[PDB]
Amino acid sequence: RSKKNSLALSLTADQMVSALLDAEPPILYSEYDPTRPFSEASMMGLLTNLADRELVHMINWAKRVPGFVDLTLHDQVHLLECAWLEILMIGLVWRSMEHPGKLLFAPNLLLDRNQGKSVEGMVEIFDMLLATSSRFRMMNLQGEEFVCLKSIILLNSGVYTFLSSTLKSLEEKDHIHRVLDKITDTLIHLMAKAGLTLQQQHQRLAQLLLILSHIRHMSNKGMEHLYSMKCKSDLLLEMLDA
Amino acid sequence: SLALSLTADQMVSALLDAEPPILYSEYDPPFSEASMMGLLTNLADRELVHMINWAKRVPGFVDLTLHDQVHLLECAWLEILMIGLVWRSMEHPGKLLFAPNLLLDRNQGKSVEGMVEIFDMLLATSSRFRMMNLQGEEFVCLKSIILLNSGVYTLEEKDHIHRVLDKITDTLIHLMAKAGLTLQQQHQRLAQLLLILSHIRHMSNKGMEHLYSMKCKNVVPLSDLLLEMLDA
Ligand SMILES: */C(=C/C(=O)N(C)C)CNCCOc1ccc(/C(=C(/CC(F)(F)F)c2ccccc2)c2ccc3n[nH]c(F)c3c2)cn1
Numbered sequence: 216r217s218k219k220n221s222l223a224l225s226l227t228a229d230q231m232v233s234a235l236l237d238a239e240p241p242i243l244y245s246e247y248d249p250t251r252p253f254s255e256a257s258m259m260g261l262l263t264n265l266a267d268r269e270l271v272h273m274i275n276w277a278k279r280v281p282g283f284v285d286l287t288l289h290d291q292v293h294l295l296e297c298a299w300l301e302i303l304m305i306g307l308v309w310r311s312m313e314h315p316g317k318l319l320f321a322p323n324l325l326l327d328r329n330q331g332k333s334v335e336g337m338v339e340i341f342d343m344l345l346a347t348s349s350r351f352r353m354m355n356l357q358g359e360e361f362v363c364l365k366s367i368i369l370l371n372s373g374v375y376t377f378l379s380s381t382l383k384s385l386e387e388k389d390h391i392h393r394v395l396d397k398i399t400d401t402l403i404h405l406m407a408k409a410g411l412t413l414q415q416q417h418q419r420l421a422q423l424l425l426i427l428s429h430i431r432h433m434s435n436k437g438m439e440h441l442y443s444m445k446c447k448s449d450l451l452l453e454m455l456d457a
Numbered sequence: 458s459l460a461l462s463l464t465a466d467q468m469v470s471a472l473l474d475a476e477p478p479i480l481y482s483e484y485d486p487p488f489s490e491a492s493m494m495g496l497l498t499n500l501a502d503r504e505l506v507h508m509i510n511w512a513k514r515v516p517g518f519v520d521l522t523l524h525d526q527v528h529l530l531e532c533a534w535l536e537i538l539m540i541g542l543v544w545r546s547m548e549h550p551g552k553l554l555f556a557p558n559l560l561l562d563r564n565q566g567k568s569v570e571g572m573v574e575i576f577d578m579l580l581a582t583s584s585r586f587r588m589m590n591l592q593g594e595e596f597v598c599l600k601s602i603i604l605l606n607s608g609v610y611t612l613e614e615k616d617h618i619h620r621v622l623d624k625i626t627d628t629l630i631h632l633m634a635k636a637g638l639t640l641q642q643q644h645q646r647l648a649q650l651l652l653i654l655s656h657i658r659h660m661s662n663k664g665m666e667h668l669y670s671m672k673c674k675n676v677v678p679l680s681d682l683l684l685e686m687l688d689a
């Protein structure tokens with residue numbers, strides 16, 4: 216199906232890992248004043264500000280993910296529109312691994328469960344994120360594995376379409392699936408290099424990709440809450456630079 | 458411990474043996490929004506009874522705590538209905554085989570509230586399974602994975618659940634190796650299938666939002682039915 220000659224598809228596993236590690240966005244500081252007690256609007260202010268800012272840098276990151284700028288502009292936009300909260304979340308749970316009971320939103324913004332209660336609904340999402348981070352800590356998730364998963368989330372985010380598909384959209388989806396197969400290869404390689412048996416490799420690949428269902432769930436629940444606070448892309452198009 | 462000893466071939470055998478009966482709708486051969494929702498609700502409610510009986514036969518599930526058995530089914534039931542739907546629908550491009558006498562096209566999908574958006578997503582997933590030539594043996598592995606995964610993070614009890622999930626991954630790989638796939642092709646197909654499950658979860662979440670909205674005729678809430686059938 217795909218007609219595109221994409222550099223990503225002929226990268227070796229090591230080269231894919233290197234490119235992903237190089238793409239990582241900068242580490243950002245919240246505008247959080249620790250002498251200021253939290254209220255609902257103040258916490259939602261802090262988080263929203265952090266999310267808006269992370270989104271700018273996420274655009275720059277996505278441009279450096281091999282295979283991503285080979286998609287049509289419309290398809291790049293769609294992936295980012297679908298995936299942004301999942302991508303924030305996986306970042307959060309990775310950073311929070313060595314902080315049992317707490318979510319490291321930023322270096323200066325470390326929140327425990329109880330501080331989630333200052334916003335209606337949000338402690339439910341907090342618990343799920345905490346559980347996810349503990350899961351990654353127990354599995355001893357490696358940085359190289361993390362960046363593979365975050366790229367998988369981006370590429371897998373798009374809405375499934377049958378009646379709503381065009382011949383062109385279908386070529387684009389085929390290109391996505393090839394990029395995804397390269398990332399799977401890269402994950403397996405990393406595992407094989409770390410000394411896992413073949414059985415252990417296939418088991419861990421499954422365990423990590425099953426956690427992505429949980430990330431999707433958390434994002435969906437997040438989105439429901441944001442939509443019900445009346446939140447409501449010309450950036451995206453123009454930053455993605457076409 | 459019997460469950461944890463199963464070979465790949467034995468796992469397949471047990472899961473195939475656990476499969477529920479295929480149900481018929483009460484459909485009488487015109488569809489309103491109200492009669493369609495009525496038909497779908499009555500079907501879902503009858504499927505649920507058989508889903509509970511099925512889950513009791515998935516290796517390892519009756520080793521779990523009552524809480525875990527109830528919680529896994531409460532979180533997963535719509536995903537489980539949906540995977541079964543898209544599987545049954547693979548030989549019916551553009552349609553959804555809710556039951557043998559209830560085969561619906563997207564036109565009929567517009568009958569009911571926020572089914573229309575979900576409908577195309579289900580058709581696409583069916584189409585993806587068809588294109589991948591998903592086999593029945595792979596389908597029952599994936600459906601048991603949904604059960605054991607959908608509530609597992611939402612400590613030694615979580616370990617048992619994880620060990621059984623690993624066994625099913627081993628079973629999938631075995632099936633693929635037996636079908637002639639290379640090791641590379643095995644790991645790629647595994648990943649492709651598990652990423653589809655993210656999308657099934659998303660479809661279920663979207664469906665749940667409409668069920669909460671709408672809402673119901675909730676005489677026997679699912680949590681009560683689960684407790685009755687599993688406390689027992
Ligand atoms: C009462 C409210 C609650 O459910 N609640 C949690 C407060 C209604 N309870 C009975 C369950 O009702 C029910 C379940 C499933 C479906 C259903 C569909 C069809 C589709 F969208 F998934 F395609 C549905 C329609 C509209 C909104 C949500 C879901 C359905 C029914 C039967 C199925 N068999 N295989 C499947 F995949 C099915 C899906 C409707 N109502």
Ligand SMILES: */C(=C\C(=O)N(C)C)CNCCOc1ccc(/C(=C(/CC(F)(F)F)c2ccccc2)c2ccc3n[nH]c(F)c3c2)cn1
Nearest residue numbers: 262263265266303304307337340341437440441444445446
């Ligand atoms: C909507 C307008 C509005 O609030 N009103 C009142 C009109 C704002 N729309 C922009 C997006 O805002 C966001 C995005 C993300 C979040 C994050 C959270 C935290 C958690 F729940 F995910 F934990 C959130 C809170 C409440 C509901 C949904 C999400 C968030 C922020 C920063 C992050 N960095 N890494 C992450 F994982 C997150 C998550 C808040 N507001």
